[PDB]
Amino acid sequence: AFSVNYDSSFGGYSIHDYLGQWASTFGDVNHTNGNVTDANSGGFYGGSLSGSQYAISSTANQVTAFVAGGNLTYTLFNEPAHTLYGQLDSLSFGDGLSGGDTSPYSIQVPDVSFGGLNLSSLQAQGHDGVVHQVVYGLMSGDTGALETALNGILDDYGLSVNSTFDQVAAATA
Ligand code: HEM
Numbered sequence: 529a530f531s532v533n534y535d536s537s538f539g540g541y542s543i544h545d546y547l548g549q550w551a552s553t554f555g556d557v558n559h560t561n562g563n564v565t566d567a568n569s570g571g572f573y574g575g576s577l578s579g580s581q582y583a584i585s586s587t588a589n590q591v592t593a594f595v596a597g598g599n600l601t602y603t604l605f606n607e608p609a610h611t612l613y614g615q616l617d618s619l620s621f622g623d624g625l626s627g628g629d630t631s632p633y634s635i636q637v638p639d640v641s642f643g644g645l646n647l648s649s650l651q652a653q654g655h656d657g658v659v660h661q662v663v664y665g666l667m668s669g670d671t672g673a674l675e676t677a678l679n680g681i682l683d684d685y686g687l688s689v690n691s692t693f694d695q696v697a698a699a700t701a
């Protein structure tokens with residue numbers, strides 16, 4: 529049930545080119561050994577360490593953001609430590625994060641959204657699970673794991689992340 533939604537200015541962009549611009553604007557939140565605070569942790573909606581959404585804003589520019597949606601839980605110090613797992617079904621990208629407390633997170637100026645991703649991983653796969661690799665890559669400004677997961681969805685339509693948004697819409701609508 530894969531779907532894409534995009535501002536019409538991105539119709540002629542490849543998926544890869546959009547995500548490359550998004551990543552280079554968002555930068556890298558450096559959520560790493562020795563550098564984690566409240567500033568670069570992001571947050572969940574629906575719980576403190578789990579919920580229907582996870583979202584985070586750029587520490588470089590304070591506005592660029594992404595919202596990950598589905599059913600997600602982070603183990604924090606439970607084994608395997610520091611793993612995000614569960615189901616990742618949507619991702620949205622753009623500028624400005626609001627909500628996240630008594631209402632869901634949303635992006636204030638949305639560029640692109642993917643729905644129906646159907647990505648699922650179990651706790652026991654720890655950091656090798658696809659949902660962990662995708663979202664921790666995004667937090668780090670690395671879209672390599674998401675593109676790999678999108679190529680695996682797209683190959684069934686004969687497309688890839690080198691296809692443009694308009695080419696994907698014509699195959700999926
Ligand atoms: C849900 C998305 C998240 C992912 C994918 C994630 C991923 C990670 C990873 C891979 C590490 C370990 C080692 C390293 O970064 O070099 C880590 C460390 C850590 N994370 Fe997260 N994290 C997430 C959210 C959070 C949140 C919401 C908190 C809240 C406090 C948090 C707190 C920490 C702490 C305290 C550490 C250890 C820092 C240290 O050992 O110096 N993480 N996280």
Ligand SMILES: [Ca+2]
Binds near residue numbers: 561562
């Ligand atoms: Ca440490």
